Ligand SMILES: Nc1ncnc2c1ncn2[C@@H]1O[C@H](COP(=O)(O)OP(=O)(O)OP(=O)(O)O)[C@@H](O)[C@H]1O
């Protein structure tokens with residue numbers, strides 16, 4: 001309910017990192033992950049998981065969509081692949097089926113967060129992903145991985161940082177240039193820049209920013225060190241590109 | 248809270264069918280299902296699912312066990328295999344990760360049943376299995392597939408029938424003979440007959456019977472027609488063997 005100190009000079013209290021499916025899945029084989037990419041990412045996420053032990057979730061994109069029962073199985077498989085890889089390197093990773101613990105009411109996800117808190121409360125790493133969710137009149141919908149950070153909003157106290165890793169440096173305006181900053185209260189310019197994919201990321205991150213989260217769209221790379229994600233924005237290395245979305 | 252009419256001449260209101268892993272998994276390859284067996288069972292379960300649409304759960308045994316994060320993935324895979332097969336023949340089957348929707352409090356599972364009811368409420372078939380569950384002090388335990396019917400007890404109104412299909416005709420007393428009936432209020436003779444596997448089934452089914460369920464241990468066979476499971480016990484075909492556990 002209360003006043004949370006926020007700013008570019010403050011350390012985040014919780015990290016939700018979303019890795020886009022385009023970064024670890026082969027076009028050259030649809031349905032197929034690139035094990036090298038998953039392995040190298042996993043190593044960089046493990047470092048973050050150890051610093052943010054009990055204060056981080058990993059959200060995977062990817063996994064091919066009542067025929068949406070298939071979707072829940074496809075996204076479970078992706079969670080399993082990340083969780084397995086992470087555990088192979090010493091990280092206590094537990095995959096959770098969002099469909100079993102979250103429904104939609106008037107379009108807003110309602111997480112029954114007891115298990116998620118349990119995994120966190122005792123210092124493990126929840127591995128999440130998009131899913132098929134039921135709503136209040138009992139219908140099933142496809143809920144994108146990009147929107148999964150929204151589920152954390154009621155639960156996370158303090159400063160939530162959401163990072164969505166994708167295959168572009170940020171929101172580009174045309175093209176010549178990226179938008180370094182978006183005010184979630186008036187994000188017209190950002191929507192106007194889009195050519196849906198990036199639209200879904202933007203809606204999701206504006207929603208989270210309205211509830212106080214510091215959000216980023218930036219480029220992921222399996223090899224890239226991500227430790228700066230634990231640090232105040234003001235202390236980030238020079239020449240990191242991102243679109244930062246805050247209120 | 249109220250008086251439920253029960254008896255050998257009454258039709259069940261809800262079916263929980265548990266299929267033992269020994270019935271559809273190869274010894275000759277551990278971790279490996281027998282697709283023929285799953286296919287033929289699925290056909291017999293589909294018939295029941297259509298009659299008990301919205302009034303049945305399928306519980307799978309099988310799937311090899313913080314290293315119990317592996318267990319939740321192993322049992323998810325088994326659920327997926329059943330769900331996929333069932334959907335291939337017209338049944339609206341949705342697999343649910345028990346670990347995401349159920350914790351232990353003082354050893355008793357506490358199901359957050361909203362999603363399970365949603366899958367049921369709108370006439371689909373939940374596919375369940377054993378799992379790793381967290382408890383109230385946040386520890387993870389292996390929760391056998393045999394105990395999964397216990398999770399339904401608070402939720403199911405009316406007459407619950409639990410059927411556990413295994414590789415024996417019932418509880419054999421030595422050996423020459425099976426116990427056709429066990430009174431759950433005084434099941435000494437049944438425990439005394441056991442030589443744990445069958446012990447876990449018996450504890451689980453005595454617990455459910457104490458809460459009014461009509462429970463059975465009987466032999467499963469991929470080919471066997473199971474329609475009599477929709478019918479009052481008194482009308483079952485002659486020479487069906489089972490151990491029936493009631494209060
Ligand atoms: N203004 C814009 N700036 C940057 N990208 C944009 C813009 N408008 C549209 N896009 C598109 O959005 C894409 C990024 O979103 P996309 O949904 O394709 O990938 P991803 O979500 O990271 O991976 P996944 O969808 O597999 O989880 C870019 O590759 C780009 O083609």
Ligand SMILES: Nc1ncnc2c1ncn2[C@@H]1O[C@H](COP(=O)(O)OP(=O)(O)OP(=O)(O)O)[C@@H](O)[C@H]1O
Nearest residue numbers: 267268269308309413415418419440441442444445
């Ligand atoms: N009195 C008894 N009557 C019958 N079976 C008994 C008795 N005592 C012990 N058992 C053993 O219990 C076994 C059945 O339980 P078991 O756990 O092995 O299989 P299942 O549970 O159906 O398959 P899964 O364990 O793969 O889910 C029998 O095969 C038998 O060896």
Ligand SMILES: [Mg+2]
Nearest residue numbers: 196197198200
């Ligand atoms: Mg996308």
Ligand SMILES: [Mg+2]
Nearest residue numbers: 443444445447
């Ligand atoms: Mg057993």
